[PDB]
Amino acid sequence: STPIQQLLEHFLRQLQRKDPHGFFAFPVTDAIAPGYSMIIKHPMDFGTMKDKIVANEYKSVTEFKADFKLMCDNAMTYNRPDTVYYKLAKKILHAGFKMMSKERLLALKRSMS
């Protein structure tokens, strides 16, 4: 493994702990969610993100954050605000962007000098 892969695997684990029931663990498809494909054109989930880490397809924390943000946007677009799915997506998005702050990324970034 490489250092960036280890950093992204750490972030991903923290985020998955905030989704204990695995709402975001696998790709949502039309077989479970009517009309999903035509509402959610850019699907994303934790499992695809793990595969992209393993495949070393992320070159930055910015790219990783964008996939995480996409996933939570999709969940808030498709599900109505009354659903546990929409409600959890809003909460992990807030927490996730607070754990990968500009600030926190600069503090961790002064540790490597």
Contact footprint for its own copies (CB under 8 A):
1, 3-4, 6-7, 10-11, 59-62, 104-106, 108-113
- Provide the minimum distance between the beta carbon of 46 and ligand EAE in the complex, in angstroms, as a whole number: 10
Nearer to its own copies, 7 or 33 (CB): 7
With CB under 6 A as the contact rule, the residue among 8, 12, 28, 53 that binds ligand EAE is 28
Burial track 52-81 (b if 16+ CB lie within 10 A, e otherwise): bbeeeebeebeebbebbeebbebbbebbee
Q: How many other CB atoms sit within 10 Å of the CB of residue 88?
A: 20
60 interacts with, out of ligand EAE, its own copies, none, CB within 5 to 8 A per kind: its own copies
- Provide the minimum distance between the beta carbon of 7 and ligand EAE in the complex, in angstroms, as a whole number: 24
Could you give the dihedral angle defined by the CA atoms of residues 20, 25, 31 and 36, in that order, rounded to the nearest 10 degrees? Answer: 100
User: How far apart, in Å, are the Cα atoms of 77 and each of 38, 87, 99, 102?
Assistant: 12, 11, 23, 26
Nearer to ligand EAE, 26 or 60 (CB): 26
| Cα-only R_g, the chain | 15
113 interacts with, out of its own copies, ligand EAE, none, CB within 5 to 8 A per kind: its own copies
Which residue ranges make up the site for ligand EAE (CB under 6 A)?
23-24, 28, 32-33, 75, 78-79, 85
